[PDB]
Amino acid sequence: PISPIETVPVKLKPGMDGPKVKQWPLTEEKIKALVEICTEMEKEGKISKIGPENPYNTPVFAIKKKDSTKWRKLVDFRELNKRTQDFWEVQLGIPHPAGLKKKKSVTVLDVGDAYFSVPLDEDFRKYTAFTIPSINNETPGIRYQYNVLPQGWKGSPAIFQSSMTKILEPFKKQNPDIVIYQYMDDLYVGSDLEIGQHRTKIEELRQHLLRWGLTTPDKKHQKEPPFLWMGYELHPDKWTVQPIVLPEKDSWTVNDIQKLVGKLNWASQIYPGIKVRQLSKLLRGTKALTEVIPLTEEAELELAENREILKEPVHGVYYDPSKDLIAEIQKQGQGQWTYQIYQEPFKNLKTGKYARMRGAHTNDVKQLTEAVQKITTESIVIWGKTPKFKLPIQKETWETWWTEYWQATWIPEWEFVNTPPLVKLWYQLEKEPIVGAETFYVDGAANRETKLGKAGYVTNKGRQKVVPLTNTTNQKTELQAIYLALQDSGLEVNIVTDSQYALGIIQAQPDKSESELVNQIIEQLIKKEKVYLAWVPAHKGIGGNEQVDKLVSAGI
Amino acid sequence: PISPIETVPVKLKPGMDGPKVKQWPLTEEKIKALVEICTEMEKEGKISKIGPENPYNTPVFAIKKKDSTKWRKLVDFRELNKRTQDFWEVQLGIPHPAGLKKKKSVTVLDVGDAYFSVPLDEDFRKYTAFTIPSINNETPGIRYQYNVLPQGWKGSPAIFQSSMTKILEPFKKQNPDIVIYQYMDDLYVGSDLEIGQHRTKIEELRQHLLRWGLTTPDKKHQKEPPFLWMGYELHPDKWTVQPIVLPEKDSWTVNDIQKLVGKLNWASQIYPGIKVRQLSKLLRGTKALTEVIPLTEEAELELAENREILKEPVHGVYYDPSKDLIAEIQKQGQGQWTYQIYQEPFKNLKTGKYARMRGAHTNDVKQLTEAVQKITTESIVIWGKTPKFKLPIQKETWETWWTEYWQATWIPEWEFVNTPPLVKLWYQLE
Numbered sequence: 001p002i003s004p005i006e007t008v009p010v011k012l013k014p015g016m017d018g019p020k021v022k023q024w025p026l027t028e029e030k031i032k033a034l035v036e037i038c039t040e041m042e043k044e045g046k047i048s049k050i051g052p053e054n055p056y057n058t059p060v061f062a063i064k065k066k067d068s069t070k071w072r073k074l075v076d077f078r079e080l081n082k083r084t085q086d087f088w089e090v091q092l093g094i095p096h097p098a099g100l101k102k103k104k105s106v107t108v109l110d111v112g113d114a115y116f117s118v119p120l121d122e123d124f125r126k127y128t129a130f131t132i133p134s135i136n137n138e139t140p141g142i143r144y145q146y147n148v149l150p151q152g153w154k155g156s157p158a159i160f161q162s163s164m165t166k167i168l169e170p171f172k173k174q175n176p177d178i179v180i181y182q183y184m185d186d187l188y189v190g191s192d193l194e195i196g197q198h199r200t201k202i203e204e205l206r207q208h209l210l211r212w213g214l215t216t217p218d219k220k221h222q223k224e225p226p227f228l229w230m231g232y233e234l235h236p237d238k239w240t241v242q243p244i245v246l247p248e249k250d251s252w253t254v255n256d257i258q259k260l261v262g263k264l265n266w267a268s269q270i271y272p273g274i275k276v277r278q279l280s281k282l283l284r285g286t287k288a289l290t291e292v293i294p295l296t297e298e299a300e301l302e303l304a305e306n307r308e309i310l311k312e313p314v315h316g317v318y319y320d321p322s323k324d325l326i327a328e329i330q331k332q333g334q335g336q337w338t339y340q341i342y343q344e345p346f347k348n349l350k351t352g353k354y355a356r357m358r359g360a361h362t363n364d365v366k367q368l369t370e371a372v373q374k375i376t377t378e379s380i381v382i383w384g385k386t387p388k389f390k391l392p393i394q395k396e397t398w399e400t401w402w403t404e405y406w407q408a409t410w411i412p413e414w415e416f417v418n419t420p421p422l423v424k425l426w427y428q429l430e431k432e433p434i435v436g437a438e439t440f441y442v443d444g445a446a447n448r449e450t451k452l453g454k455a456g457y458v459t460n461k462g463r464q465k466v467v468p469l470t471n472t473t474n475q476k477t478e479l480q481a482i483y484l485a486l487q488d489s490g491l492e493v494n495i496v497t498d499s500q501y502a503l504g505i506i507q508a509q510p511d512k513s514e515s516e517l518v519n520q521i522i523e524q525l526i527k528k529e530k531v532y533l534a535w536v537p538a539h540k541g542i543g544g545n546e547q548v549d550k551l552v553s554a555g556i
Numbered sequence: 557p558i559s560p561i562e563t564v565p566v567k568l569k570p571g572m573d574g575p576k577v578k579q580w581p582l583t584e585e586k587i588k589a590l591v592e593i594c595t596e597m598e599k600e601g602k603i604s605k606i607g608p609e610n611p612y613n614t615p616v617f618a619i620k621k622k623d624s625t626k627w628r629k630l631v632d633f634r635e636l637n638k639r640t641q642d643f644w645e646v647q648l649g650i651p652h653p654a655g656l657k658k659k660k661s662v663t664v665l666d667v668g669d670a671y672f673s674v675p676l677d678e679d680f681r682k683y684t685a686f687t688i689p690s691i692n693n694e695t696p697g698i699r700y701q702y703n704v705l706p707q708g709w710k711g712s713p714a715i716f717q718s719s720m721t722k723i724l725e726p727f728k729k730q731n732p733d734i735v736i737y738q739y740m741d742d743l744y745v746g747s748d749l750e751i752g753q754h755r756t757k758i759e760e761l762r763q764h765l766l767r768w769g770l771t772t773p774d775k776k777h778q779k780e781p782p783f784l785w786m787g788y789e790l791h792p793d794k795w796t797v798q799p800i801v802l803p804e805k806d807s808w809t810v811n812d813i814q815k816l817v818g819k820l821n822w823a824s825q826i827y828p829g830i831k832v833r834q835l836s837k838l839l840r841g842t843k844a845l846t847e848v849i850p851l852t853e854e855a856e857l858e859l860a861e862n863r864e865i866l867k868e869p870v871h872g873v874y875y876d877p878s879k880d881l882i883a884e885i886q887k888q889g890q891g892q893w894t895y896q897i898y899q900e901p902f903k904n905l906k907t908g909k910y911a912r913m914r915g916a917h918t919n920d921v922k923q924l925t926e927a928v929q930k931i932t933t934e935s936i937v938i939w940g941k942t943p944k945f946k947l948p949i950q951k952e953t954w955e956t957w958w959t960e961y962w963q964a965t966w967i968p969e970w971e972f973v974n975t976p977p978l979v980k981l982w983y984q985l986e
């Protein structure tokens with residue numbers, strides 16, 4: 001049922017030409033499944049049988065998908081798809097539910113085969129030619145030409161989502177506030193009208209459409225209030241995801257842990273509290289999707305700790321442009337943060353989690369402010385505003401990681417919360433060297449190919465030491481040397497460092513790590529009174545390297 | 557209702573296609589400000605809607621120029637220039653009057669509205685398409701294409717160049733010594749006259765620019781602690797540089813010297829070959845930090861040599877026009893920042909210390925943007941090219957907040973720092 005809408009001009013990339021093939025000659029019955037459909041598809045004017053003078057072609061799959069009662073075909077445009085020009089992507093995303101409004105009544109209209117109605121430009125039609133030869137080879141050259149947008153074809157969903165944006169336009173103008181949305185084969189119309197009055201606007205629409213060419217048999221708004229939109233479970237006044245049943249096994253491959261890390265992730269939108277850390281922690285082996293990985297006990301400890309919050313269902317509120325937007329962030333440990341966003345207290349709009357990965361030694365204050373951004377970004381992408389932050393961090397420990405940090409940071413409106421796991425500085429180094437305190441010249445060395453280190457130090461009052469190490473990297477060792485040096489000091493100390501690496505890693509004053517080595521330096525720093533970390537260049541005799549690297553000397 | 561002129565055929569760079577960048581999500585008030593703008597402009601025949609047959613793109617922002625009242629549109633044409641204008645940096649390039657950097661007082665006028673008259677090529681326009689964003693990805697984009705010359709584009713003043721020479725003519729001879737440079741939508745004007753005398757010399761050009769066409773230099777006004785009364789008067793006469801504040805009172809102790817050995821050891825690959833030995837051997841021992849130790853006899857020959865070598869560089873200043881400047885900024889404190897304009901690492905083409913009050917906003921992402929703008933107008937006056945920045949900031953924070961305190965026409969290319977430098981010690985020219 002061709003539409004009388006302004007068609008769009010399609011072209012093939014310069015230098016190219018339309019495809020040309022000749023398909024796998026079919027027999028009696030299969031051709032009978034094509035002649036029937038095609039010679040009544042032409043009657044409805046979707047195709048047209050143009051014989052000679054057109055040199056191109058394309059194949060026809062006579063695919064009765066599943067096992068239909070009525071025979072169906074499908075012409076594979078794989079070669080054309082390469083040759084045609086580039087269109088603007090319609091799929092510029094997905095309107096995420098958290099930013100949807102409470103539009104009282106809603107309905108969905110099936111614009112499924114509304115692609116074959118919109119017409120294709122009158123010049124391109126030849127590049128969509130396809131032929132079907134007979135069994136007996138008696139009357140060959142049975143070739144049609146597509147009049148409307150064919151299935152699959154690159155520009156189809158492009159041209160459609162644009163043709164139908166022009167079609168709804170006069171309606172939308174005449175009668176606003178009766179908000180429309182569209183995706184592929186759906187029409188999500190909804191307003192603040194009492195059902196019958198809403199049942200009118202729908203039939204008005206259903207007839208404007210029927211007048212513009214595209215038939216829509218959604219028998220009197222034939223679609224129920226509970227919706228399955230791209231996974232999202234939608235109800236006329238709240239949202240969530242309905243089916244999210246993640247099974248368990250006894251010996252699964254990576255192929256299945258990736259689906260696992262998938263669902264738990266997705267569920268993070270609504271279900272307050274969730275972490276997919278340890279489940280993915282071991283996925284390091286980016287091997288084949290057939291190798292089994294004996295899940296750690298800390299992954300089940302999490303998989304189960306998820307299954308509870310996940311079992312008993314959670315609801316989802318909508319947006320109210322007048323009501324505030326305020327978000328808060330809780331520390332869920334292991335360098336994992338979780339946030340919730342509210343207008344009217346407690347009831348949730350959107351929840352989600354931030355977790356720094358692949359690049360350790362990061363600060364908590366820093367990890368906090370990184371999460372805030374992730375959110376400040378997600379806000380503007382959705383609601384169009386920025387959440388007033390509710391944060392578990394003392395101003396006097398924040399402006400000390402604004403005025404003290406190298407990189408520049410910036411968090412908008414934020415207010416102080418109260419929760420046992422407060423975010424703050426556990427320690428802080430000195431700026432001016434300490435008086436009287438013992439001066440520890442530290443040194444550390446290892447083998448580039450013999451891999452057997454040596455730690456140690458020397459003090460301003462002849463107090464030496466060296467703790468031989470094995471299976472320790474030069475980096476680790478330079479680090480181990482300071483810890484050693486930490487342990488042998490009273491309350492306040494001074495430490496001159498060989499390494500810039502270790503220096504710049506202890507300067508940022510971190511806190512968490514899996515490396516017991518760095519965690520152990522941290523612990524010393526936290527209990528110590530006044531710590532001062534100096535630095536002198538290696539390979540240049542600076543400090544005391546003359547006798548300092550003459551003692552920690554290896555056999556190579 | 558129109559007046560159709562003639563077109564300069566614009567074509568693409570060595571076998572290239574148009575930019576297909578993506579529209580960064582925008583605030584609400586701003587998406588409202590953009591349609592407020594683009595629709596009147598649509599009525600003005602300047603821009604126009606397209607369909608799917610045009611897959612190209614270019615970012616659109618919103619900025620409140622000078623003072624709060626009305627928004628300005630901005631188009632990150634950074635990719636199209638990269639596409640088209642590196643062949644139009646040749647075929648149709650605008651020469652840089654290298655004396656602009658010496659002229660006592662430079663001023664900048666927004667002569668960007670003058671292009672919106674010149675029609676753009678029927679066959680090229682597609683590559684200037686831009687898209688207006690929607691909140692929460694509800695509705696499909698408000699998709700426009702440029703009919704005339706885009707005010708962002710680096711290939712606009714190149715076209716209007718012809719017309720700009722002809723329109724400025726009467727002034728350039730009535731006022732001969734005045735050096736005028738046209739970079740983008742800007743007209744940099746420089747003389748040897750003092751404030752009072754130059755400020756009117758500019759009004760002169762303004763009125764001349766008014767009469768002779770509808771080219772118009774937008775009204776200038778504002779009042780920050782720093783005098784922002786008349787125009788954006790840059791003074792290329794004060795271009796002197798010595799950020800390296802070597803501690804005169806620091807060689808008293810052991811720790812002071814340990815510091816003094818560190819800064820100096822950088823000036824090694826910067827200033828090829830330096831003598832520091834006689835000083836270093838003074839703390840060759842594992843002594844106490846706070847030990848107030850006097851310097852050795854042959855030590856002064858190490859300090860004062862470099863201390864006088866910190867008064868005259870040599871090769872560095874060599875600007876290769878077939879390469880580009882790199883600007884790297886590093887935070888130093890509450891108000892002060894420090895930059896380095898090099899081109900091939902360690903060879904400093906120009907360094908300086910951006911600053912501001914401690915009793916001011918003391919906002920990091922305000923100073924960073926207002927410093928980025930500075931580093932750049934300076935490099936126009938000097939090199940005629942915008943530097944590649946090496947920013948000390950979170951990629952994603954900048955992407956959010958730059959477009960807020962960015963009172964500026966052009967948008968330089970950028971990069972962000974992953975690691976913590978030792979360069980922000982007291983001040984350091986990398």
Ligand SMILES: COc1ccc2c(c1)N(C(=O)OC(C)C)[C@@H](CSC)C(=S)N2
Nearest residue numbers: 100101181188189190227229234235236
């Ligand atoms: C149960 O269905 C819904 C409940 C709430 C809303 C929606 C659907 N929304 C929507 O776009 O549906 C999906 C495809 C995103 C939109 C406009 S629907 C006319 C709004 S403002 N709130």
